[PDB]
Design a protein around this ligand. Structure first.
Ligand code: HEM
Ligand SMILES: O=C(O[C@H](Cn1ccnc1)c1ccc(Cl)cc1Cl)c1cccc(C(F)(F)F)c1
Length: 452
């Protein structure tokens, strides 16, 4: 009836230790010991892991009073704000908040986003000079921070950003949300709260200034390719006619940037590293760039939509190194899985890291090989063989923007620079909420066209 258990080391703490050591290695080991479904006690919580592509229907198809996101991720409240996202008054209200973000991620906006990528990267190359070495992860994090800001918030953020360490403030927020806050939501984190407050006042300022700009220049609000997420948030109410508060607006913005800061920057690092460490892969990538760019000197949205191989590379970095290593739901109702019934109160857990290495779906899963997808279609086997962006009702609404931003960044960097990585491809580091490459991650670079 109930699934098999992992025996607890001691009571209460249960399997925390080996889980904490390497949450991914933990799930593979015990999936062998106990099958496709098993439960473990981890710092007081019943956690049921579903580890086979074939059984993921139970997870992804449910509704939000069968399987709740809000019962598990509410602990993000200090970062996102009161009444926002998983602390929204209702599921329905959370969905509306999400649609405000997605409403600023239209085709029309995507055309302008590509220009933004070119601009930020052009400022960045001045700063890098014609040759050098650089930390890849830091570089990606900066480029993604400055470009997502401008994409979601409008260009008028940009001086504030340079001139008030927004990069740093996000580092301090991000460097005060431990995975252990899942288990103890009260773990005080005073630097985090300090940062968050600070970012809030800045976004307050920006919202006030945008209101004066909408006084004078309302024609802007008719133009599709000028409407950023800040604009949608000032001019839209909820479906039932209730107005949004500035606290909600700020919280949604912060969540929006947070979403696609770290995941997109990590994914661009893994992608770029594997691409330049493999001659074959880099040949095909460069070949594609050259076909698509022809005689044009800059990128645009149609060009990036043609980069199928670069995309496959990105997808392959997401199979091998997904930055959200675990996805979770709370059972508000007992729930059927295979021959078992997972009871109310259990947390269901699926891991895209475990899925990405399943020999049942992928041959030679430790090899970075974009051709497993483009040619062999290996992903297509099971319906849920590939879940880097999720599935069903809470699929990532940021996917197309992410793909757009990573592909653009890597394509532009390839255009400017020959690059070589230093050392072996690292392993993932399980020391934070969003999992990224273990430092050091460095690379040599050289400008492909010069003036000295
Ligand atoms: C490579 C980059 C990214 C990856 C790998 C990624 C991955 C994911 C995954 C796996 C989920 C499913 C979460 C779950 O089922 O519990 C998800 C959901 C989501 N992602 Fe992303 N994401 C990325 C970028 C973005 C960006 C840039 C944004 C926003 C600007 C975004 C916004 C969201 C939102 C709002 C959801 C919630 C969907 C819902 O509950 O309706 N993501 N993402
Ligand atoms: O940032 C977001 O979620 C990320 C996980 N993530 C990153 C990319 N895709 C998902 C997340 C969720 C829960 C926890 Cl405990 C930890 C993290 Cl890092 C997110 C989720 C819903 C809505 C929104 C927004 F308001 F902006 F629309 C943003």
């Amino acid at each position: 009836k109930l699934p098999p258990r992992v025996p607890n080391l001691i009571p209460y703490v249960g399997s925390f230790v080996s889980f904490a050591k390497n949450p991914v290695q933990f799930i593979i080991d015990n999936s062998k010991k106990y099958g496709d479904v098993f439960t473990a006690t981890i710092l007081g919580k019943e956690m049921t892991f579903l580890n086979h592509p074939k059984i993921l229907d139970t997870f992804f198809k449910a509704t939000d009073n069968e399987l709740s996101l809000r019962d598990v991720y509410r602990f993000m409240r200090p970062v996102f704000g009161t009444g926002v996202v998983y602390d929204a008054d209702s599921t329905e209200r959370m969905m509306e908040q999400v649609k405000f973000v997605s409403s600023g991620l239209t085709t029309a906006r995507f055309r302008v986003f590509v220009d933004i990528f070119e601009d930020e990267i052009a400022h960045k190359v001045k700063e890098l000079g014609p040759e050098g070495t650089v930390d890849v992860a830091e570089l990606m994090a900066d480029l993604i921070i400055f470009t997502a800001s401008r994409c979601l918030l409008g260009d008028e953020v940009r001086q504030y950003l340079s001139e008030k360490n927004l990069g740093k403030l996000y580092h301090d927020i991000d460097d005060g949300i431990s995975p252990l806050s899942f288990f103890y939501p009260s773990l005080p984190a005073p630097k985090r709260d300090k940062a968050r407050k600070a970012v809030g006042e800045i976004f307050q300022e920006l919202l006030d200034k945008r209101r004066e700009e909408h006084k004078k220049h309302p024609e802007r609000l008719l133009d599709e390719s000028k409407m950023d997420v800040v604009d949608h948030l000032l001019t839209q109410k909820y479906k039932d006619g209730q107005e949004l508060t500035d606290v909600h607006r700020i919280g949604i913005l912060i969540a929006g940037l947070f979403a696609g800061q770290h995941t997109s920057s990590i994914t661009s690092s893994w992608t770029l590293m594997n691409v330049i460490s493999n001659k074959k892969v880099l040949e095909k990538v460069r070949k594609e760039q050259e076909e698509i760019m022809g005689s044009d000197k800059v990128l645009d949205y149609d060009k990036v939509m043609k980069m199928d191989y670069l995309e496959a590379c990105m997808k392959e970095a997401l199979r091998m190194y997904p930055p959200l290593i675990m996805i979770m739901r709370m059972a508000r109702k007992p729930r059927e899985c295979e021959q078992y019934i997972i009871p109310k109160g259990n947390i269901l857990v699926v891991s895209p890291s475990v899925a990405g290495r399943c020999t049942d779906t992928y041959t030679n899963p430790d090899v970075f090989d974009p051709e497993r997808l483009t040619e062999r279609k290996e992903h297509e086997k099971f319906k849920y063989g590939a879940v880097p962006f999720g599935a069903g009702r809470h699929k990532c609404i940021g996917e197309n923007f992410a793909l757009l931003q990573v592909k653009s960044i890597i394509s532009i960097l390839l255009r400017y620079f020959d690059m070589e990585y230093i050392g072996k491809i690292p392993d993932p580091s399980y020391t934070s909420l969003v999992v990224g490459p273990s430092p050091p991650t460095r690379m040599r670079y050289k400008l492909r066209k010069q003036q000295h």
